[PDB]
């Protein structure tokens, strides 16, 4: 029970971190597109 609870928390934390990184990369790509298209 203890190990399942800890692993579940770790998995959810990583699922949040991957979303944060994905949004950061998406924002960088969008800014690059905006700068290249219309300054």
């Amino acid at each position: 029970r203890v190990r399942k609870r800890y692993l579940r928390q770790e998995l959810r934390d990583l699922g949040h971190r991957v979303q944060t990184y994905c949004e950061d990369l998406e924002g960088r790509v969008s800014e690059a597109e905006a700068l290249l298209n219309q300054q």
Binding site: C22, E26, V29, N37
Partner: protein, 36 residues
């Protein structure tokens, strides 16, 4: 030219969305399957 770069970056945005959604769905699936 810039149009090819713009199309490639749009594809990059789409693939980022797909990867994020797939990873969240996968972790949720294994959480409901085994962790319960």
């Amino acid at each position: 030219n810039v149009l090819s770069a713009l199309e490639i970056l749009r594809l990059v945005r789409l693939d980022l969305r797909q990867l994020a959604q797939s990873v969240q769905d996968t972790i949720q699936h294994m959480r409901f399957l085994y962790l319960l």
